[model samples]
Target chain A: ASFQSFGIPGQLEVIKKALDHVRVGVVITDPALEDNPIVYVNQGFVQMTGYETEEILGKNCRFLQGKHTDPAEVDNIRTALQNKEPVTVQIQNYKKDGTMFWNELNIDPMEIEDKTYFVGIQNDITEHQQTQARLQELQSELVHVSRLSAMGEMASALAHELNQPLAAISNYMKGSRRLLAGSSDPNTPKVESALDRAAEQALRAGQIIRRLRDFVAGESEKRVESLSKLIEEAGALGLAGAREQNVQLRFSLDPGADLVLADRVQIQQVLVNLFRNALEAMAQSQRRELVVTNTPAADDMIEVEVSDTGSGFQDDVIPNLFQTFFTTKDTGMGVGLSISRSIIEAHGGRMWAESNASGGATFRFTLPAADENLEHHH
Target chain B: GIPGQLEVIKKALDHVRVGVVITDPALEDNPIVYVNQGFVQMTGYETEEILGKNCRFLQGKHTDPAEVDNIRTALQNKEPVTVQIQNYKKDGTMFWNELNIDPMEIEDKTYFVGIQNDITEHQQTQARLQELQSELVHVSRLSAMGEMASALAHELNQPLAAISNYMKGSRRLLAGSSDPNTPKVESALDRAAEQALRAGQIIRRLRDFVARGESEKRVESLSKLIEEAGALGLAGAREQNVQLRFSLDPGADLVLADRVQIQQVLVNLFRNALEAMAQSQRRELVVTNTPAADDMIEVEVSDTGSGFQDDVIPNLFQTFFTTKDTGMGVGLSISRSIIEAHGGRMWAESNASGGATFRFTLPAAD
Candidate 1:
């Protein structure tokens, strides 16, 4: 073989001999040949593919692809080749021994005068992909831990808030008992009314305790649940903040699309997230309104929309609205939308947002409708 | 002549911001075979002085020994290593240096390429940001407590004041009556005892609302809520000679509201009305609940007092926006918040009768 024929400066025999010691897999294919056969491959390619040099010389690169190979990636390679562009893609390829591995393939086309050739390099990246997946898991873990700590702080404040009322109740009960002792008859109508009021106040305390408990308990197992009830509960939670801001909340739900296959708590969390965001956005607006509606969408999906009467999202921010840690607020985790989107998508659904014509943002999400089969499986 | 690209490579290395050092691993002590202009400028050393010396010259008293050991082990294993450590210049001034070292084999010759970035300013900025963040968290917690305390003040006052009212009634009956042992006198004492117990329950509920871990939803009567709120908050109105009037529609008197929370809202509105009318000649407060729509019950509290300014109306319900010289302005904001929590709207408008009217609407319980 002559180096000059391929426009290489060095002696072909010497370069070829030296390349066998290289660890990276390298192959050169002939465009002129039928089916673009591999005309030359280094010893490293033979070692990487577990194929003998003589056996693989006439084969196309497609032989490495197995049943699970993504067709889009194959088309991507084909498109790059047709346009004579350099391409790099990670693909799952099976070795000659029939074991799967992630291959980071880089291909470059070369034209030496009237001759066309393609050079391809391959690196096994299965371990790298696995490591990347592990890092993503760790990132989500960090987000969860941060959320829990923030919640803990809120819980402490709530405890302090409940203390005064409990103490007051103690004082009232003792004072009433003292007054009763001094009275000749304890069963007077006036006294009975006061006692009833005291009982009512005690019930109020019980309600607060229950509310606090439910707030802290957080997530629960997924099940087929009533969608309308979940939305109502979430609306109530969202409105808690709205009450402070003097924002109007309106909801219209179709009873027909009421059942959904979901983790009730998770779905409620998404609703609350949307509602709170709408209220917060409208804090400075003159006409502050948050309208929530749930209706049936295409393919048995229940669609919900939360619209606000505040300033809509800026053009640039719309694209990154659901991105993790993206925030317009100075003080917030900015993870609510991202997590909500993730939860929606995990349930085989979609979540999105749009700028409303009435000068605000509208967030929409769809959940898979509950089916008898799904319920049975669970 | 050497390749034309060789000069370009040399220029590129000299112009690069990161300090670069190439050491010959085959040489004893792995001395630096080449030093770029950036490396010379960073260490305050001449190119001539730096060449043929080990990069370890940059390390001084402040340099961490553990990091030095890590670098040594990485070089021994012919692997890459990255570390952030303190390094000293020729003048003995210390700075944070992010260093990356990678071993390379070119034409059978082994070399170690080291990249250095001075990160002292970046480190300082990060520390300052962390300090600010912690301070903000502390400040937020304090503000949160302040808001809760302000709301609690009024909540405690209602029951405490009721207890006093009962005690005085009992005292008046005991002192003025011809026969203190009469059924009427006994009834007054019974009322006093009942009011004390009711006060106690209010305290208990307050504690539960603050102390409990969850919120529960229940159907509540709108008429009853209005009555209780009026009764608790209007005692002050009476003292100020403010006449109170109630016009509630019997049909729209049912609502789904947190009992304690809605009462807080009502009390806040009433108190604000009473305060506004303190200096007015016609000290009349009208509270009306009309069926606004099939789905909503509208409640309005109108006062014969100085109405709000155009600019103030927008911010009237905002937290910390107070016209009063005393008391933090969180009551209206919290009241609105509570109403909103119950899926309702609260707002203020100037009345046609020369006063301000605070109006809110709640969803009718179906």
Candidate 2:
């Protein structure tokens, strides 16, 4: 047999021999034009594509492009071929009968004289994509842990806070009824002020809902806000966390502290994460003191530090600090620092941590001062 | 004359954890007659400081205007109002105040009693609750994206098979069909080749979208994306009812965000720019992705059309903030949220040069 003949053996057609040799799916069309039928397909391609020769041959390839095929991608191909650039892409298509699937498609050009042809390589990445998806789901479990810690602290506070409004409702309603009975002076501003305060309190309860909704929704897209206001917000949140963890939170910002321009929601998230970290660090330690302090740092920089009098970081764990899936804790993804650093850096800031001198850990970050007087707008 | 009752009332207020005060409507237009020990403790004041002062002294700058206004009216009509005000203490510190004021009558005498509670702890809890709520929302959005990404991945796989088949056939035909000049068969071959390529492009996008959630956003050429979209038929004139052109200034980074989110923001902005310009006769969208001054980067989407009403501009990023009749209103708002969440600001400018330009800033990656 000649070199070419051996390459395309007859135990199978030359096309079949060539197609089967590689791993990805391969389809060979006969040179016969009208019914340019599938003459051969390799076992590897068959395994990748889930199509049999009998089912694929004598049928238009359009059968592979079901309704789910992306129209934009279809257009992209036209543009690519028009420009005659080799394109590597993932495309949505149909199977031998009519089953939807994703093909990690790579197409290369082959030209003889002026006539041109193409070769498409496909890797069945459905399982791979699914695995990624499953991984994301698993990740959500970790996210849930953080979320539950943040939310669990708040649920109890909300209940207690809401009771104030409920009690106010009773006071305002009874007072208003006394006036309506015509026994009390109708024009008394004091009575009027009392009712107004009740309405305000009720709305206050609603505002808490809005904040809660925003937090859970992780929604807020705007310019950097005041660190003081952000810190106040954080205190309100961390207070609940403190109570839930049975720890006392001592929060204070140093005089003349600078502002850190950052996203409101995500900053709050950093605070929540810090609280969680502190709580975890102190879970077994008796010193349940989680202190949040903000002070001026080097050159117009503001440092907000969360320090806990708990078991400090093990000397060994500090090296792999921000790496994902390198948790020293029983249930930790070790992602808080990673996410926090990314967010602070995204906000044009920096974050880092050090083992505290007094058997605790302090996480501190610096943010450049933002103009406090200017109004922040989206 | 009323000294005896005041003494008893003050004594009762001292023992209560809830702060308590009494207003004498009869004494001098609802002047504060008494404040209890709890009131002094919660407000960081001595009893002498608050007594005889106006109850409104407790109201601070953080108090909402609507609540203050309502309280004033309610008091005028002898109606009580309970409000949550940001009250300032003697130390000039602010804390959440849950205030309840009521009118009482004691045998031909009228007094207004005010009860306040230190919900500093409660407020903290509520704030935390909100954080959880926000996380849930973020997770839900991710899950939504995941499902779509998975579905798209599955859908793209089939044409992948055909592309594999047709591409192989075309490769063989290239060696066999040496003439290269037949219009009919040549076009058929071209079309098959094109479809195969289209399949590949779709697959790449899906892979890029689904794989590797941990992509770092860095300085990238905006023109490359423009080129990809243009090659993807995203520049089709009918879709936007206008011609699309992209101008990129040589830049370090044009935006900062998760790579996927920035791409998403662009897709949404492009869609909106198209929708807003669809009816205009001078419809043209000029996207200028450029580096901003002071280490800030900007992507501006400009369209020749009616600009947003000045009134609606301020609340444009507010959720359920909308002007379009058919709009779910979350599109721009959510886009704003995503950008803001990334520590960026998204806004629109009515170009004095004409038309509306939506611009957002991303910190240049160092």
Candidate 3:
């Protein structure tokens, strides 16, 4: 009677094969019964689950459920079906073989003679997830290594700072003891000055330790740092320990050096390391020349270069010069270059070296250019 | 052509366009008695420096010994000989001269008339042509080897990855038993694997050797070609898993050459013979260069591959031939083309018991 009543005959049979050929997994759940028992399932679902018709016919859609299946997804389906509306969601379900698979599910509800039915389609996406995870891990590892190199350098600078205070403290104690046992009361003035110097030195040491701790523990933070100002400050601090070694310092900075988004202390640390290395390279030279220069390069970057007049490295030593503990000098620890490289790279910059014009080496690195409109993330 | 006409032959040498130089019979010293305008211009040289100077003056620190030897042989036979000799210009700039020295029998005075075509530019063009040929050969080598490299890396990486996974799995068994036989076996296997990193070193060295040879040895990096080769080829001794590892340092600064040719010999040896033992599983290739080895920088491609079959060894340097069917039969020959064009030699050796090595040399920098 149903077939006779319907003007179109054999249309459902053709629809079945056409539906079976689709790439998306399809399921039809009927509203005439509780739990919306499956009215039909296509070849995609069977192929996906490794199950055949006799095992699934007239079964509630719960056959595809397990502990991993999202209850909210089931609730979304039920709520949409009750409301007689279409719903789309990324759903999780298990196959007959117990493999948990993610499905990008889409559903559309249709009403036929007061009876409701829901159509669902799904796709598999395991390989995509695997590739994404692998790429993410590789990038994360690169960042992690960069951070470690920076931390190693910060430790060295801190050690160098603390060593100065410790020596001063010892000198202070020895001077005070000698003054206390002296016969001339007025000679105590020397001890007073020495004590005062030691106290300032201790404070200087404390300030560095505090700064180091903050830098090491700091999360990603950005702030306005003027390159010209930074250069002046860095040159002063960088050359403070060098002038005694007779290393001549010369610098030329771009007059229009804009501000940059960077870690001020980290950048200064990099500059100091470079300055120290330059001085060390020229320590034995008849004429020690250390040059610091800056120039605007790309739209979003500025470059700083440090050069020394000394014996330049052979062709082989430059590439590995920045790797951990790869010092060419007899008394040098290779960590300085490694740390500087790490710091520059952390700001999404590149650092590399080349032979200098005056028969030595020059190291150049970049920093993120300041975006004038955006508020600096201090 | 009588004995009395020989003096005019020497006197008339100035009119010749080609380079004319005579080897004086006194001490059998080969020197340039006269050089023409064409020879001087092509050589970037003048007459005064060349005249009365033994040809040895032109054969400075960088001349290939084989070339010198061949020229010596030619002169000894008192025969008309045509060969390419790498000679320097007056400014100490090197140029390849296609020199033909004939013992002119005019009056039977035995004066040698040398006709030279400055092949500097010609040899340069020839090098450029050979480089293109070697590039094609390299691309083909990659195509044939790519399939094997992928298969080997895949098959080997999977087992290696699995072994790591299994070792990690057995780490959980440490809590399960007081004395777990499974963990002991797995742990021992893991330790053995840790010690057997010869495979990984070989893999890394092979990878590095290929990567550096393919990229870094360009014209710009000519100065560091040998050093690059050493760093890339170096591995822990026990891990190198090869019998011998050595380097012949070409101490002179960068020469004018296609750097790829210099490394091609090493890379070819690395893939073909070094891994010969491991051909079933593994092999190692040793590479080096030095000033003392020869005036030219030498690169030796030694492989543990079964030494060349006695019959097949001699023809190893010939063109359009190979042992591999898929091989286009042109790698070594093309390599020889590249080397010889740069004034060098590429050859091979069958080891005493097993394996064979290929060696090539290049003229040092001017």
Candidate 4:
């Protein structure tokens, strides 16, 4: 149980050098010391809290903690200290500059100089936990859209099957009415009129069927709007929580590429699709940077590029990636990209993808600029 | 510090609800090398029982064949695979398992990490909703057709009955006339009355075909159906100058079935046989019953007129497949559906006497 620094000269030097150089904060406290104050400190703990050794030693480790620190977490560390056990907790810690960060602290009992001491290892885990939380929200949102898609399928199926018989019934009754037109008997007129009633009812039922079909397949109403606003809305939907994951986003819009005539929702859906894929591509990457830029192109078309510092797709898989139901994911429907491409094509635009030199991917799309005089003339 | 890190990491693995299992791919059949408490709680297999065994032991009857094939292919290619599959616990209760397996490399050798989540309640919720909607649409489609046809048959029968009465009364009134065209008028009226009566019979038969019976199955006498339906079938047989014979074994007359539905099939077969021999010179209709196999009885209706067309034999029971220009051709299809639903089989074959035989087997009662 002797913690006499083990050997003669270089033994304590070796341990001290490791504690001073390690990226995580290290602190040593002796239970015999009054209030179980800090006995040893390292440069990591100094830089982590912006405190000099003179101010750090003889002070309790709770000096860096404040009201924002969860009381239960503080209690846990105390319990472990009394019980001489290991403890790990995520706590809020403040620096000298008044900025706070999440600290994952692990504490265990260590024997040093023939007495028991507390060893604290502090690791900052701000972005990692944020990454996990954002993943949860996105998947939950995706689940809701899947359910809505199912209901849409039900509506379309209902409209088509019922419409088949109603149309036939209407035509059949109309044919009967026309056939009776040549009749000269007094009862002919009444029978002919009766057939008309059935014919009209059939038509009315067919109209209802058409209206129901139209509701589920509502093509978005296109209008003139700012492309900047459209992109910002999509970013909010697809990349709102990405900021916490240290995903840096930059937007650069050309001065002349100001407006476009488009369905805001449809274009937003396409951009959101690209944004989510881009974020997911960077899930395992070291640097997650997304860049969006627009420039005026030939024939007055505006071009937009979304680039990510993430793993690019394979060349062979690209040719079929936009084809219907072709997927790279095991659980995904493989419908989002194909459906997204269709929306762009419907907007009189072209979409393509390329590999970036920085081991990432880039998706580009183009939109025809709005007729300049239309806005002024209206 | 390293040892403590490993302990914390191990605790983290046990903290998650998702079951984790590490399998050694180099082992025979890839046995489990380690499992967390989550894995133990999920499968109801003790740690001692779970080790040194292939994962396929969890598979049981009703496990999805598609998922199993995908997993094997993924393992062969060293690719990650995910699937929602059916698995059974040691207690034999089957549950839906959402499983993910990926090939991981440690230094040079490869191991497989399997993550399992019990998603029985989640999957069954969607499946149950999907099934309910499917049943609702299917049942409504048939229900609407049933009501529509019944209404049509009943409405048409009234007018046909009126026309038959009108033709007969006109013939009587014209018989008292001594006009020069009396004989020709009498002939026209006689033809009109015969046609009207024929139309009336057709409508009444269609009416009988509508209005389904709620399947009430019980042990009943097959001989009684043969007697009653045969009586009705023979009414038109004598009109067409056909000879009919019934050979019944009292021993084979007992059957377990829905009496009304089974009776309808017998009547349908009898009508078809009578119609087949309507133009034959030696018209004969035979209705017979015999023992087919254990707990089964065979019944056949044979005709001596026209055997089924060689090319049409395959499609005889298909819906809306007709040899007659005026026929709906739904009779055999509907009849077979009922027979199959009652756990029986119905079929037709060319008869030895240059005609056709429609045979069906039913569950027999001792």
lDDT per prediction?
0.64, 0.56, 0.54, 0.65
Q: In model 2, how large is the Cα lDDT of residue B156?
A: 36
Error of 3 at B184 (Å): 53
Candidate 3 per-residue C-alpha lDDT over B189-269 given as tens digits, one digit per residue, 9 for 90 to 100: 345345324334433433333331222223323336644434332322234465555544435445556654454444345
lDDT (Cα, tens digit) per residue for candidate 4, span B1-366: 433333333443443345777777787999987676767899999999998888888999999898899999999999989998899988999988888887765434577778787888766655644543443332332233233333333444444444445445544554455545446545544554454455445435434433343546798897887765554344556657888788889988888887656766776677667667767788888888898876789888888978787898889987557787445465576678668867789999998888988889899886
Tens-digit lDDT track for model 3 on A1-378? 233112123223322333443334666666678767776676767887667866666887667778877888889877876788867766677887888877666666654435456656566656545655654444333222222222232332333333443344434334434434432434334433433443443443333233232113233466888877777787786577666777777777666555777888778777876765566567668778887777666646777888889776442144564432233321122323544566788788888777767778778898877753322222
Question: How far off is model 1, as Cα RMSD?
Answer: 26.4
lDDT of model 2, residue A61: 48
- Model 1 B-chain TM: 0.48
**In candidate 3 chain B, what residue range of length 10 has the lowest lDDT sum?**
B1-10
Error of 4 at B104 (Å): 10
Question: What TM-score does prediction 3 earn?
Answer: 0.27
Sort by lDDT, top down from the best: 4, 1, 2, 3
Which parts of model 2 are misplaced by more than 4 Å? Answer: A1-378, B1-51, B54-96, B99-153, B173-191, B210-212, B215-219, B225-235, B238-241, B252-256, B290-293
lDDT, residue A235, model 1: 76
- How accurately is candidate 1 docked according to DockQ? 0.01
Chain A of model 4 scored by TM-score = 0.47
TM-score on 0 to 1 scale for chain A of candidate 1: 0.44
**Candidate 2 C-alpha error for residue B75, in Å:** 18
Tens-digit lDDT string for candidate 2 (A121-202): 5666676577556545543343333222322223323233334433444343444434333323333344334335434434
Off by over 4 Å in 4: A1-378, B1-22, B25-80, B84-153, B157-202, B218-244, B249-256, B267-285, B291-296, B303-337, B340-358, B363-366
